[PDB]
Amino acid sequence: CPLMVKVLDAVRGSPAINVAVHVFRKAADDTWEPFASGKTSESGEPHGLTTEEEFVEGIYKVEIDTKSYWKALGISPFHEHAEVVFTANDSGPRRYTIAALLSPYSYSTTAVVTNP
Amino acid sequence: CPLMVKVLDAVRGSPAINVAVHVFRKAADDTWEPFASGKTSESGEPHGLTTEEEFVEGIYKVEIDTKSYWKALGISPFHEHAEVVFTANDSGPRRYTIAALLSPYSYSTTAVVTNP
Amino acid sequence: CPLMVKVLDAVRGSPAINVAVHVFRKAADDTWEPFASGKTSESGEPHGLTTEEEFVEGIYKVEIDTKSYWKALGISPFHEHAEVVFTANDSGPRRYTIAALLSPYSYSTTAVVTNP
Amino acid sequence: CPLMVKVLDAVRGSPAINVAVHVFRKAADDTWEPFASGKTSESGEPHGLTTEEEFVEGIYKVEIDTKSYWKALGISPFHEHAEVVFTANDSGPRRYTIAALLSPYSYSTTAVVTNP
Known part of the structure; x- marks a missing residue:
């Protein structure tokens, strides 16, 4: 997979399960255009x-529906969601991994580019 | 000041100085309308x-122009910008502080909410 | 104040109030000698x-007692405490600010160094 | 492996390679006692x-020698190293993963406990 997403829960110390992930690509018209989407597995990853x-x-x-996740656990969240916006492949693609770490009032994100 | 922002540089160990910060509000047509903007001072905060x-x-x-920051410094950035999306004042007026920590391939964000 | 500390709670969206902060200096026998200590105010900072x-x-x-904090709140913590180890004043006097962000299973830390 | 460590570089967007990792366990005498150690592979993990x-x-x-890593790249670091201290297995072991994200003046750490 040229693009992987991994989501973690900082309150319970586990992968975040059943979380919706949506990916969009910018068009020449300068608007956002659906590209890929999925729901996180037991590993905290949406496969393929x-x-x-x-x-x-x-x-x-990359958009991650964090609000629906926290509401289901009975914990009050701050963010509507978590978004990560980036330029890809400028000197060709490789393998891209986008990680996201979640708390009710905070999140952090990192990108790991490795030679395939 | 009911909305405050603070930005830090994890590479140089300093506040992120002269960074643009843009604020938008969601309209009834589901578009983002301009609401406010400013630039960070020597303390990493845009005042007022x-x-x-x-x-x-x-x-x-809330949108932070991380791409122009790393470029003026002669460093290659991954992200186009760092975002934060939230519902405000639903149960009455509150004061909000948004903190952001910046690296070339990663960022984190947190919110502090106090009753005025 | 040449050494400053600031602590935030990523679960409640507030400063971490009434948390103990302990400071040690390395001795010539390679042991850690007590140097200073304090407790965080309503702003999440121990003054002076x-x-x-x-x-x-x-x-x-610098050692932050995260374990006693999560327990008073009735939440299960993973870490015993959050640490930060560094060489200070090697090229002359400087001022240091240590920021810490706390979740039950995760923490982050950053340093801001300014010339006095 | 009941205990795994994974180290990432936030400046270059890659796994951190050739980094020393040392693990210690507290003895009843209340002193630190060597338990395991290794060097990170191309994946950013010390295997087995x-x-x-x-x-x-x-x-x-868990101690990670971050200072030696940055010095080798020709980038000035702040920390002597990065340490993570935790209580294990309180209701039996499972599988523990300790992740660390590195910048010159900052680091963040998270723990992921999954059912084996």
Whole structure:
């Protein structure tokens, strides 16, 4: 998978399960355009987001529905969601991993690019 | 000041100086309308973004121009910008502080909410 | 105040109030000698930890009692405490601010260093 | 492996390679006692830290030599190292993963406990 997403829960010390993840790509018209989506597994990952042919250079946005996750646990959240926006593949694609760490009033995100 | 923002540089060990901060409010057509903007001082804070009279109920988006910051410094950034999206003042007026910590391939964000 | 500390709660969206902060300095026998201690105020900061006369060159350790904090709140903590170890004043006197963000299973820490 | 460590670099967006990791366990005498150690691979992990028979309930400390890593890249660091101290296995062991994200003047750590 050229693009992987991994979501973790900082309150219970576990992978975040059943979380919706949506990915968008910027078009030449300058608008956001659906590209890929899924729901996190027991590993905290939505499996098989995209393919190598489809993931070209460009500007991408990863949206994680954090509000629905916390509401289900009976814990009051701050954010509507968590978004990560980045430029891809500027010197070709490799393998991209986007990680997100979640708390009710905070989140952190990191990108790991590794040689395939 | 009911909305405050503070930005830090994890590479140089200093406040992130001269960074643009943009604020938008969600409209009834589901578009983002400009609400307020400013630039960080030597302390990493933009002073006087808004007022108590202007800051009503709604869904808000805070956007930090991380890309122009790393470029002026001669460092390659991954993210286009760092975002924060939240519902404000739903159970009455409150004061909000948004903290952001910046690295070339990662960021974190937290919120502190106090009753005025 | 050449050494400052600030602590935040990522679960409640507030400063971490009434948390103990302990400071140690490395001795010539390679043991940690007590140097200073305090408790966080309503702002999440312990005021007046040390002075310019007392804060000489050396290797320092800052320890935050996260375990007693989560327990008073009726939440299960993972970490015993949050630590920060650094060499201070090697190229002359400086001022240091240590920021810490706390969740039950995670923490982050950053340093801001300014010339006095 | 009952205990795994994973180290990431926030400046270059890669796994942190060739980093020394030391693990200690608290003894009844209240002193720190070597338990396991290794060097990070190309994945940012030191492989095969311990075994199931050896990793019993107790208080543990994970030390990551961050200063030697940054010095080798020609980038000036703040911390001497990064330490994580925690109570293990209180209701039996499971599988423990300790993650660490590194910048010159900052680090963050998280623990993920999953059912084996």
